[PDB]
Amino acid sequence: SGFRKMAFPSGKVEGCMVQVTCGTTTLNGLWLDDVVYCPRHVICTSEDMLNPNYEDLLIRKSNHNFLVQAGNVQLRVIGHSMQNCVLKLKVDTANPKTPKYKFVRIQPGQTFSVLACYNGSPSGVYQCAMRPNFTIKGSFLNGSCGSVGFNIDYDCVSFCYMHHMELPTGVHAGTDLEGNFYGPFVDRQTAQAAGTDTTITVNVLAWLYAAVINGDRWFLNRFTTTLNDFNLVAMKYNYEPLTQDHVDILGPLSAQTGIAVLDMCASLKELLQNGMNGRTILGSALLEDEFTPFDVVRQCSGVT
Amino acid sequence: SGFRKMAFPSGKVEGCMVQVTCGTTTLNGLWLDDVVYCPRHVICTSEDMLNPNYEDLLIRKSNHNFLVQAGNVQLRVIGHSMQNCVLKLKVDTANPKTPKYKFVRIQPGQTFSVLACYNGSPSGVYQCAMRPNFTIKGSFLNGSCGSVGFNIDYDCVSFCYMHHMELPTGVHAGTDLEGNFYGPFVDRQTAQAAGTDTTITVNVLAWLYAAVINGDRWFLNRFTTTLNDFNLVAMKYNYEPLTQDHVDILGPLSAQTGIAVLDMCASLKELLQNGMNGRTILGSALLEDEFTPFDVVRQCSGVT
Ligand SMILES: O=C(Nc1cccnc1)Nc1cccc(Cl)c1
Numbered sequence A, B: 001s002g003f004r005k006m007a008f009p010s011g012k013v014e015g016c017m018v019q020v021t022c023g024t025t026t027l028n029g030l031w032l033d034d035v036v037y038c039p040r041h042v043i044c045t046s047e048d049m050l051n052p053n054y055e056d057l058l059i060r061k062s063n064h065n066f067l068v069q070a071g072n073v074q075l076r077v078i079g080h081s082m083q084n085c086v087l088k089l090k091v092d093t094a095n096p097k098t099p100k101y102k103f104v105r106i107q108p109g110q111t112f113s114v115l116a117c118y119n120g121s122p123s124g125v126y127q128c129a130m131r132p133n134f135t136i137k138g139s140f141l142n143g144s145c146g147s148v149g150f151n152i153d154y155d156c157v158s159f160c161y162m163h164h165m166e167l168p169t170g171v172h173a174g175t176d177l178e179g180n181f182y183g184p185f186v187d188r189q190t191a192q193a194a195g196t197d198t199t200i201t202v203n204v205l206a207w208l209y210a211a212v213i214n215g216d217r218w219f220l221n222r223f224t225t226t227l228n229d230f231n232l233v234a235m236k237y238n239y240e241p242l243t244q245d246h247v248d249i250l251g252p253l254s255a256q257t258g259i260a261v262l263d264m265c266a267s268l269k270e271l272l273q274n275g276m277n278g279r280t281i282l283g284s285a286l287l288e289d290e291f292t293p294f295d296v297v298r299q300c301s302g303v304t
């Protein structure tokens, strides 16, 4: 029992972190096989960041200008290429620590672990959700760029995120490992509108099932609701509309607890309309949305 | 910017996890050098757990009865010994993945990362605080015993905790790596009183400084207080009494923000007496106490 915001074990990802330097900028790279991936803004200077012409900035750079260091060993760069907002540096040595890996583009509302790094060295690991508006509320400082987000299925690391920037609002933006930004963001030092965010309804419901499994049941009530009635409440409280797909994904949790999904929706409806009344659920005084139904089943079953 | 409940990178600890089986019980062991450490209750059966005579149960066991598996390789056990509530299994092979390590007994209120494991395999990593009452509010299932808590200072892993049991209340109890329980707990299937817990005042204050550094300043006020006046409020709200040692430890955070420690104490006093008024601080609707001043400085400075 007990429920924590649990990150994946970061060992397989720590073995992939390197330092990338170009000119006066140093950030993190991910070394998989004979390729080092890093944000393309490593090639910029303070004069460039307002509206960099990346194609032009990269033309002034040669293989020898990209200094890649993995701990104490220097990697030899034999090729460089820009793919969207990421640079791919071909190196002459395949990473002996390369795990089984995939590059995936996660969907908004899905979760992942972030291994925050500075100068190619890991500082910490935390669990994140990709917000419905494609931002992440992380913990990153200048130098953390190139830190990656990932999920692990037994021995395969699915990399889903690479950190690129902090918006003027303090929220974070980045790309998939093909350099495609999540959201409307561009890698420029400019004010950029993050769209209206909503709460990930299916995750809140999954976390309410996690609460029930772990003994916190005060919020359960004698009511039920329909998808339509619930969705009017979700609309009013800036919650993502619930669909039958979401109900279907909550099936295992519904089967384990014996509480029908629409009955849990009626609990959530009462928590939205009345608040917590100074009470807590799994140590929280607000409705948590950064656990998916998959995360709940995995944590409550002990998947390694 | 941003503030997360950040765990240490778990790679150095994942390389130490093994599976320990004795009879019909399987749990986790920590393999450091040529020694495997695990909870001594691995030698019990369901008939024994109410009041095991560990000395007697261990006498019926030989080196060949302790099956230690590190992934796919079996380790050869050449010695066994009980030290307090831990078994030390001498193996003929030193762990090639042994990092620089220390065994430390942490103080209540200090934090650490837990690498939850099942059958010698890591499932996840999370940050914990040792409660003032020597319990930990973790996430552990049956089979998680032997999972360890640790801190990392550059390349040295200070192991501080090994998981032994879940109390009937759902909170967790365990030992240091010499087998000494934290708190009054004994490794028996019996109801055991956890003492009255309090909130870790110095940590809440450290987290209020983390909030200020990251832009959340609404709670700051025009008031100040004394250690004595604050301690009367702390007494009323079951907060640990604040001492000059705690104020001294908050010195760096006080210097960085320019907010005197007693001024931050007056903010905390108003939050205790008036609550949050439906507002949040660093994404939380309650006062967080699982970040030490050291954790705040480290996260806000980027120590790797
Ligand atoms: O945000 C940037 N760095 C940073 C700082 C703090 C936290 N995370 C990241 N650098 C940057 C500046 C302007 C545009 C771009 Cl793409 C990158």
Ligand SMILES: O=C(Nc1cccnc1)Nc1cccc(Cl)c1
Pocket (backbone or CB within 6 Å): A001, B041, B049, B140, B141, B142, B143, B144, B145, B164, B165, B166, B167, B186, B187, B188, B189, B190
């Ligand atoms: O608690 C025990 N296991 C467990 C289950 C769930 C979460 N954490 C641990 N086993 C045990 C039973 C009785 C006394 C002792 Cl020391 C150990």
